[PDB]
Amino acid sequence: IVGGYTCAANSIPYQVSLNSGSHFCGGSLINSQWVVSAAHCYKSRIQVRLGEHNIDVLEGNEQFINAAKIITHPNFNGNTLDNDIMLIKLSSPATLNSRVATVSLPRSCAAAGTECLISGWGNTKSSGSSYPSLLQCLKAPVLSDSSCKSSYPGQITGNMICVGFLEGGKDSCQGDSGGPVVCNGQLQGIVSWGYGCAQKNKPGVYTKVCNYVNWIQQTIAAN
Amino acid sequence: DFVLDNEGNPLENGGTYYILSDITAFGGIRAAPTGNERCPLTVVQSRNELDKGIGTIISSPYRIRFIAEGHPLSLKFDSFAVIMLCVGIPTEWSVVEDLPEGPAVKIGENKDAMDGWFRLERVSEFNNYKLVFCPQDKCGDIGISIDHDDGTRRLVVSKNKPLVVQFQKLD
Ligand SMILES: [Ca+2]
Numbered sequence: 001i002v003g004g005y006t007c008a009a010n011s012i013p014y015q016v017s018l019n020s021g022s023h024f025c026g027g028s029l030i031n032s033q034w035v036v037s038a039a040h041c042y043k044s045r046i047q048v049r050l051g052e053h054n055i056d057v058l059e060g061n062e063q064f065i066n067a068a069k070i071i072t073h074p075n076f077n078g079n080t081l082d083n084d085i086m087l088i089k090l091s092s093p094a095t096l097n098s099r100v101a102t103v104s105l106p107r108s109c110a111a112a113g114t115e116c117l118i119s120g121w122g123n124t125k126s127s128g129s130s131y132p133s134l135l136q137c138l139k140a141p142v143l144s145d146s147s148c149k150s151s152y153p154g155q156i157t158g159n160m161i162c163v164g165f166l167e168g169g170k171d172s173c174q175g176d177s178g179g180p181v182v183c184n185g186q187l188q189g190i191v192s193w194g195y196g197c198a199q200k201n202k203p204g205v206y207t208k209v210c211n212y213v214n215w216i217q218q219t220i221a222a223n
Numbered sequence: 224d225f226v227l228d229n230e231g232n233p234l235e236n237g238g239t240y241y242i243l244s245d246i247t248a249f250g251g252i253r254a255a256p257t258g259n260e261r262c263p264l265t266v267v268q269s270r271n272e273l274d275k276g277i278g279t280i281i282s283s284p285y286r287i288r289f290i291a292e293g294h295p296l297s298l299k300f301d302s303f304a305v306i307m308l309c310v311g312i313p314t315e316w317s318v319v320e321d322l323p324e325g326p327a328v329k330i331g332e333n334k335d336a337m338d339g340w341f342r343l344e345r346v347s348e349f350n351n352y353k354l355v356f357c358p359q360d361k362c363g364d365i366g367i368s369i370d371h372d373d374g375t376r377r378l379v380v381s382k383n384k385p386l387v388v389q390f391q392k393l394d
Contacts, residue, residue: 020224021233024288040285040294043224079295079340079357081284122286129237131288174236175288193284204286 001118002126002198003170004138009053010061012119012135014103014187017049018088018178019064023131026120026179028187029102032093034220035067037178038190038207039076039086046070048090051099055121056133061099065090069223073215082157084192084207086178087219105217106186109210112144116163116183118204120191122175126168126198131175138172140164142183143203151203152195159211163189164203172204173197181206225289226343227350228390233289238392239278239301244268245351245387249376251276252388254300254314254330257375262309266316266328268367268376268386277303278393295340295357300330301393316341318356318380324368326356328378341365346387353385 016035018025020043027037027048035048051061069089076083094100110116118138123129140163143151148162156162163181164171172179172191181189189206196202225233228240242252250269253276257265269276278301283294290296300314317336319329326337338359343352354365366384368377378386 022288024225024233038285038287040287040291043291078293079342079360081295122288123237129235172286174286177286177288191286193286195284197286 001120001122001136001138001176002124002173004124004136007119007135007137010051010099012117012137013099013101015052015119015135015180017052017055017121019047019049020045023055023121023175025175025177026191027088028180029094029100030105030187030216031102031220032096033090035088035090036187036190036216037086037088038192039072039084040078040192041178042070042072042086046088048088050094053135054133063094063100065092065094067091071219071223073212080157081155081193082159085190085209085212087216089223103180103182103187104185105213106188106210109208110142110161110183110188112142114142114183115139116142116181116188118163118172118176118179118181118191120172120176120179122177123173123197126171126173126196129174138170140170142188148203148205151201152205156205159208160192160205161189161208162203163206166201166203168198168200168202171198225291226352226390228392229350230392231350232392234281234390236285236287236290237280237282239280240390240392241275242279242388243275243391245347245349245389247272250274252279252378253277254303255375257370257373257377262312262331263305264312264329264331265375266330266378268378270374270376275391277301290343292344293342296342298341324377324379326363326380327368328365349389351387351389353387356380
């Protein structure tokens with residue numbers, strides 16, 4: 001997260017870190033056993049770390065649970081960047097409490113202009129890199145689809161939303177992938193891609209979760 | 224999974240690496256003028272074994288921390304010294320089509336530049352990789368085309384390829 005602030009400790013209790021040696025992607029807890037993340041974060045061995053605030057220090061609130069099922073969307077297309085969504089089933093359920101809680105799936109899609117909260121432990125610099133210990137937070141609005149399509153001509157599908165600022169300066173970044181965009185208490189986006197970070201005219205592009213609610217419910221029920 | 228450098232660490236998405244030969248025969252990747260180019264516009268493998276080449280910035284549009292096999296990539300040279308007439312040359316790698324020696328990897332401004340992404344795939348115990356180009360699946364290996372007049376080892380999309388490389392962190 002470039003241009004954000006340090007979140008209050010455990011104030012984003014649905015945030016998870018995907019860890020394979022170290023943190024490499026984020027994700028969101030949607031029930032006691034299932035995490036939603038980005039398909040491009042797929043890896044054969046993943047440990048999900050819940051209840052984190054400082055990912056470098058054991059604070060006493062953490063739950064480290066191995067991924068049992070890792071299911072990328074059947075239409076994920078690595079080189080068109082489309083359908084970038086994945087479900088992870090935990091090998092045992094998370095214990096839900098104040099520091100570890102679920103986020104709600106959207107009842108409808110978010111209107112342009114809706115303000116959202118993006119969070120993650122990704123790079124905080126648009127040039128060079130600096131990976132923080134503490135979770136970073138950013139408020140940013142859903143951009144209009146026409147704005148979004150004009151930012152990346154030919155690249156934006158119906159499964160993508162832009163969230164951020166055309167002025168740049170504030171954006172998600174490398175290491176934030178898979179993490180939540182939550183508007184009005186509902187998960188509306190998954191950090192996916194962009195050109196650089198926090199560049200003018202190059203907002204972040206996010207998986208449009210409201211397109212996937214049925215696939216998500218369907219997969220959880222069958223698995 | 225993650226592409227690893229020659230110290231066994233995952234490549235940082237957006238990091239700078241020397242792209243070194245898998246064999247002791249050659250140096251790293253750099254730019255040289257070729258044919259009638261008056262700026263160093265051709266991406267080549269150095270024939271000097273001591274030459275690391277130019278540091279290359281390897282990045283994916285995906286906001287994942289590390290470079291994974293199969294992810295779409297952009298490559299661009301870090302700043303290197305050019306004559307004053309060549310200052311400001313764009314350093315992003317492009318594949319320029321319908322060149323004599325087949326589609327060739329070039330930097331600078333190219334109107335013929337194919338739309339596509341590079342990707343890395345593991346070949347080798349040791350951490351060895353090949354580059355492929357995927358025009359915007361159907362992807363072609365990057366290999367070497369020897370300039371007849373020059374001897375220059377030019378990077379081209381080559382069926383009977385590929386160039387095998389390992390990465391070393393600038394840091
Ligand atoms: Ca911790």
